[PDB]
Design a protein around this ligand. Structure first.
Ligand SMILES: *[C@@H]1O[C@H](CO)[C@@H](O)[C@H](O)[C@H]1NC(C)=O
Ligand SMILES: *[C@@H]1O[C@H](CO)[C@@H](O)[C@H](O)[C@H]1NC(C)=O
Lengths: 25, 49
């Protein structure tokens, strides 16, 4: 991840999943 | 020339696949060792240049 969402063009809203959070919880 | 823009560098190798030109340029940049964020962030400027 390297920036702000506004700068890039054609970027689509989506959800990114992290493997680590589930195990921690 | 038509093939290069629409299909990038993929067609010479085999049957052409359609990819976005902006994305195509990013792939070439990686070849030179610059990450993709650089091309997209400076995309407006690059077009003008
Ligand atoms: C992609 O092409 C469509 C054509 O309907 C256009 O509406 C959209 O703005 C384009 N996406 C860009 C410039 O990111
Ligand atoms: C989804 O994308 C649109 C682009 O028009 C943006 O306005 C909106 O804030 C985005 N949704 C978020 C960040 O939840």
């Amino acid at each position: 991840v390297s920036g702000n969402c506004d700068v890039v063009i054609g970027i689509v809203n989506n959800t990114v999943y992290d493997p680590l959070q589930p195990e921690l919880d | 020339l038509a093939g290069t823009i629409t299909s990038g560098w993929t067609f010479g190798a085999g049957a052409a696949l359609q990819i976005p030109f902006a994305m195509q340029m990013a792939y070439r940049f990686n070849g030179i060792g610059v990450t993709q964020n650089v091309l997209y962030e400076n995309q407006k400027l690059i077009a003008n240049q």
